[PDB]
């Protein structure tokens, strides 16, 4: 079996940017997640006025 294909092996994590080739590196990988969450939340809020009304 190919270790580079399985997601849990360290070879895959090194050959796909998951692992440094340390905390700062992961924080750098996860930049902009907050913005994506905020955009999804804004879209969901603006796409369901009736549910907001029943919430009130």
């Amino acid at each position: 079996r190919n270790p580079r294909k399985l997601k849990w092996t360290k070879a895959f994590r090194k050959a796909a940017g998951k692992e440094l080739a340390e905390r700062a590196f992961y924080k750098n990988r996860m930049r902009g997640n907050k913005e994506k969450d905020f955009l999804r939340d804004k879209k969901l809020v603006e796409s369901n006025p009736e549910l907001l009304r029943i919430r009130e």
Binding site: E19, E22, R23, Y26, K27, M30
Partner: peptide, 9 residues
């Protein structure tokens, strides 16, 4: 070894 996890952030 494992690095940084999602919960550890």
């Amino acid at each position: 070894f494992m690095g940084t996890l999602k919960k550890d952030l």
